Amino acid sequence: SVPIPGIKDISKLKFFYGFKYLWNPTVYNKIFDKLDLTKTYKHPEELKVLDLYPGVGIQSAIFYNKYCPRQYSLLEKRSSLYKFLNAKFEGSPLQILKRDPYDWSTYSNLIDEERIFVPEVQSSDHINDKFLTVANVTGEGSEGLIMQWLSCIGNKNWLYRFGKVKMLLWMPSTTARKLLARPGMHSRSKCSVVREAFTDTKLIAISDANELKGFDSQCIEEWDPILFSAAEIWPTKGKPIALVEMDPIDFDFDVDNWDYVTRHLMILKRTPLNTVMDSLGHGGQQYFNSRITDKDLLKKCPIDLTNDEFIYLTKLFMEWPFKPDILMDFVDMYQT
Amino acid sequence: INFFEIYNSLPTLEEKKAFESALNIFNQDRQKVLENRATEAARERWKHDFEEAKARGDISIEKNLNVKLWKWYNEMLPLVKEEINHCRSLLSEKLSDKKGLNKVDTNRLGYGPYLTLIDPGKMCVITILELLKLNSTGGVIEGMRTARAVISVGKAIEMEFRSEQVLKKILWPQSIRARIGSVLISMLIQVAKVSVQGVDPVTKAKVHGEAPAFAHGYQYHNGSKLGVLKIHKTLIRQLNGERLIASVQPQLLPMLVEPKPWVNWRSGGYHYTQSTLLRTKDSPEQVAYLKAASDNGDIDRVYDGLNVLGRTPWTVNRKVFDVVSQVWNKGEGFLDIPGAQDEMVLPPAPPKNSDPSILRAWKLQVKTIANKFSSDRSNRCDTNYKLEIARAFLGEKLYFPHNLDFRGRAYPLSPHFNHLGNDMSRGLLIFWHGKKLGPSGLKWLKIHLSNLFGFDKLPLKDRVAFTESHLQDIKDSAENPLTGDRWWTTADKPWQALATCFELNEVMKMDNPEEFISHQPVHQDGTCNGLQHYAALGGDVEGATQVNLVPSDKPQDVYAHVARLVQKRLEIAAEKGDENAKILKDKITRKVVKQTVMTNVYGVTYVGATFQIAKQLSPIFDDRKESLDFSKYLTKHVFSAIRELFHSAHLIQDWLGESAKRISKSIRLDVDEKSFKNGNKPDFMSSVIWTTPLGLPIVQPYREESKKQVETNLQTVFISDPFAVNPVNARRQKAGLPPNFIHSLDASHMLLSAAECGKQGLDFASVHDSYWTHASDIDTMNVVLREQFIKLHEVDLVLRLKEEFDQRYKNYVKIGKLKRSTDLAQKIIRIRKDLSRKLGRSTTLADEIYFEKKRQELLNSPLIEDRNVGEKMVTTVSLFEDITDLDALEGMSVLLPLRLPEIPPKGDFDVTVLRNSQYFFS
RNA sequence: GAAAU
DNA sequence: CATTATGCATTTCCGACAATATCAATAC
DNA sequence: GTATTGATATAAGTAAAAATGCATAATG
Ligand SMILES: *O[C@H]1[C@@H](O)[C@H](n2cnc3c(=O)[nH]c(N)nc32)O[C@@H]1COP(=O)(O)OP(=O)(O)OP(=O)(O)O
């Protein structure tokens, strides 16, 4: 008993701020059937789910028509899209809230101030079965939002203090190639490093067959993505859109030191490790050469390393007696 | 030996001049040893320090620091020797194709011959000193930037080679300089070892070991990698306490012997150092035009003005210096001295599970604390260095050689200590020569004190009355400058106010003020010099009357008038009665009105005006929460007031801007023969150029920057070659032409005044607009300023400027689109068809320009018969040259001749009327 | 941060 | 040509200001 | 055959794309 907008309604929306949305109910139901969120969430009737940047909201409408959670809220500040959502979804079990998801204060006010959306805190033993977050960051200029969300996954502050919360993220295919980069690939970046350190991700859907060449073939064949054409998104001129599933994992290291080590090591991702240690600090080359016994590790480049060797190097940096003060690693070009 | 005290004690003029001559002949050796370079001196000092430390066993002080420097040099020298030997061996190869082509061919052939010249020990010393001097620069907390590192070492080595040339390939490529600097810095990083202590968390005990002194790392600033060298904390703490003198002597200091007068574009200033007459940084056009003008010898008046500016002798004000020393030694932050800050303190780290907003706020707070601490230390170090220079030169006579920037304004050669510094530096300087006050000396000293306190708008009689009323506390402050009433700190310029109060007390104590001897400079500052120059250029009676150009009983103030206009506008807005109006009703500040009204006529934008008013509203804190929106409201109102008030300044500005645009969008006819390969839309290599009345040429250097990565050993630095001529910055040139013109006019007037004062026999010091002379000579100084201003502005400067543009840029072409339907275009299309018939394809503007240049050469060709044939040829520019209405034609792309807009009408206003305007310059 | 327009 | 973008008056001095590494096509 | 040239990503709250403070330059 929930209406679903169509492309006739969607063509009346002048501004999308660069965000691309899929409007095909066939693609949404295929994606949901592949995902099978029911096994993880035993009782959807008591499930609480929060959505960020709904935009069109057909995904939210189909999700409700399928599972019917107890509470489902949308966070918006875009004027035209918010007005359209309010007009279409008024007098419905769905709920729409006019708050900008970008602001950090938004979540703190929404949860810790006036009880509007209260999740349940769960231990890091298993994926939370009472909280779920869905976002849409297809905008090209909002990569920093996704990276800050990954850092928040690492720091257990923004919304992952409630436990291991599964995250669905509509997000650009170029960033998909960036994040889903196995060691040795030419697209390996610190984004991928933090992705594999903090989470384990699976790719679900992608709007372009050509983009699948970049990704790892074994990962593609194991995931079996639901490929779909480029005619299911109203803005055609935009770049291809992919989907990822974010599942936090347990980790035992110091986030600040690990971040510093990765950032200052894999700047020179093509150089061999026999010389990159000099960038870490003073005497780092000699210290790591003396400490490390595995000679193959030194021959391996930072683009060939993985989270295990990164944690090993972080531990070596920790028991380095003369490690530099990583707190003050910044430039003082600041307004005064 | 207090030379100033001895000179003042000498009672006879003959023996005074004899003592001055003896001091001058005595100080030659001291000046030479001060001006001498630092390489050999530092080498010998380090050698002696190492030998005495060897004799005494060891040390743990800056002596040990110099011993470590000697050890670094001794270990480095074999490496540089081996590198030079390798370069020499590789340069003797008869022929090879790929002999280490990755490394040897690309680099050793690049920087072999350049490195093989200079002494390896000299290069070692230079690179060590350069890297040690470069500390905490480039925005790096504990190190410095690689891009500056490689260039500074390369530039210093080239300058060292030039020093070897004068003892007997004029300029080195930027890539070669960067490569040499990177190579030497790499060798230094490989060698420099420093011991350091640490505690192993597993061991939980102190560890003794050695670590490299320098490290090459990368830092991220908003997503951009930075090349950073990091200096070890031991070296940081062992170099912090030596200031800028103990480690190595400075290079630019005030002299003691008479400065060498300006004769050529390079001959002047320091005796054993060459200083360019123009502050040309990376402007080949500027240096070329300056060389041509110097060869033509038409800047003798500029030479005379600079000689007069740099001939005046100075000395350090002993009393104010003692007061400043007492305040600094007391340790507490005074009005100007920041004070002693012990060390850094950082806020405690919030829990890692706290809110990301909280973490961001903590990070911002830490960054702010770090920036504030660094800025305060730097300020305290600079003040300490100024005090050190003042104490070193206390009691002696000082000379200040001057220099000019491309606009023509005058600047001292010594930047650390000068009369252009802050209030403390200005107060710590007095003239060496003392002159009797005469009848008007007391009056002028009183005027100087009163307008130092900020009462310069009020008439001279009221200023004298103010000083007479406050003489009691003047005497009080003079008797006890510290631990007393402290009346001088209530002034706008406390240190100069203190000095003037001392002089006034000395006058008051003496029975006869007529015969007193004074050394205090008296500042005679003009009011609204830019608006004055507009008034003189346009001949507008209203503007001249507003800017005190005409004689008057009371001095009118444009700033006060427009402030009252803003008062009226806001009291009209009181009907709306917004919060901004209610807050800003009785708090419109003459300082913000000053800045905005003054800078409106130079092409200021709305954003710039908002920033200026917000910045000047910050100290008084009318809107402590956020002043930006109210600043925008005020900018709107003041802009409305200025647009309704000013009407001829705007006309001159608009004409200059349109001329600048037309110049910046043109191209040379025959010079464009070079294959720029763009075909239809060429590049622009035309910069606005004109000559000052003094004869100094001016070249605006606004050009695009071609920054490219160049491969070096350390990294691929991102620098730009300054020798690559690039297309001009049209917007920059158009926005900067009027201010450059006005400041050039101001500098020309100042130089004429200085030359005439030197001829008349006065002591002249000029802080740009304001002029400084003795208290007795103020009347003759005012007379000579007025005479020189009449001489300068009695000619139609704007008309002569347009004539200069027309003479210089007669044979120029400006590309302008023309409507297809135009009947004249049909002839143009037919002509270009012939230009297409010979070419066989679409007509090219390059070929059209070449054809146009063919006709122009024939007009000046020696052959009269061919000149008639040359006049027979017709082109697109030739066809239009018969038509004067350029706007009539203004589709198809057609070449157009360069025609500058006609000057605005010259208003009728006699300039000589200022001979009796006592308030013109005050 | 300082100086001038 | 109506539509869309770019930078915001000038100059001097000071530790000011200010990217680099990796990988593709290509030009030779 | 290979070396020079151009493109792209890094980190990640100085958002970005709506607006607008605005004049002028660059778009298709
Ligand atoms: O107040 C200044 C000062 O503390 C410091 N600062 C910034 N630039 C300089 C400089 O060239 N020289 C000195 N001695 N101090 C400097 O920072 C404060 C201003 O910070 P901003 O980021 O606004 O600085 P910027 O250079 O961009 O502008 P300005 O305010 O100094 O003109």
CATH superfamily of the largest domain in chain A: Vaccinia Virus protein VP39
Supply the CATH class of the largest domain in chain A: Alpha Beta
> Please, how many domains of chain A?
2
**SS content category of chain B:** mainly alpha
Summarize the main sheet of chain B: 3 strands, antiparallel
End-to-end distance of chain B, in Å?
39 Å
Strand count of chain A = 8
Spatial sequence of strands, sheet with the most strands of chain A: 3-2-1-4-5-8-6-7
What form of chain B results from the Cα inertia axes?
A: globular
PDB class: transcription
Keywords: gene transcription, rdrp, RPO41, mtRNAP, DNA, mitochondria
Assembly: pentameric
Entry title: Cryo-EM structure of yeast mitochondrial RNA polymerase transcription initiation complex with 6-mer RNA, pppGpGpApApApU (IC6)
Task: Output the keywords.
heterodimer; A: 336 residues; alpha/beta; Rossmann fold; Helicase, Ruva Protein, domain 3; 2 domains; eight-stranded mixed β-sheet; 8 strands; B: 922 residues; mainly alpha; DNA polymerase, domain 1; three-stranded antiparallel β-sheet; 34 helices; globular; binds guanosine-5'-triphosphate; DNA-binding; RNA-binding; transcription; gene transcription
Characterize the structure shown.
Chain B: GO terms for molecular function: DNA-directed RNA polymerase activity; mitochondrial promoter sequence-specific DNA binding. Chain B: Belongs to the phage and mitochondrial RNA polymerase family. Chain B: The active site is at residues 525, 594, 769. Chain B: Keywords: DNA-directed RNA polymerase, Mitochondrion, Nucleotidyltransferase, Transcription, Transferase, Transit peptide. With 336 residues, chain A is of the alpha/beta class. Chain A folds into 2 domains: 7-248, Rossmann fold, CATH 3.40.50; 255-319, rRNA adenine dimethylase, C-terminal domain (Helicase, Ruva Protein, domain 3), CATH 1.10.8. Chain A contains 14 helices and 8 strands. In chain A, strand 4, helix 6 (143-155) and strand 5 form a beta-alpha-beta unit. Chain A starts with 6 loop residues before the first helix and ends in an 18-residue tail after the last helix. In chain B, the strands form 9 sheets. In chain B, strands 1-5-4 form a 3-stranded antiparallel beta sheet. Chain B has 922 residues and is mainly alpha-helical. Among the domains of chain B are: 3-33, no CATH class; 38-250, no CATH class; 541-646, DNA polymerase, domain 1, CATH 1.10.150; 813-897, no CATH class. The interface between A and B is large, with 36 and 44 residues. The structure holds 3 DNA and RNA strands.
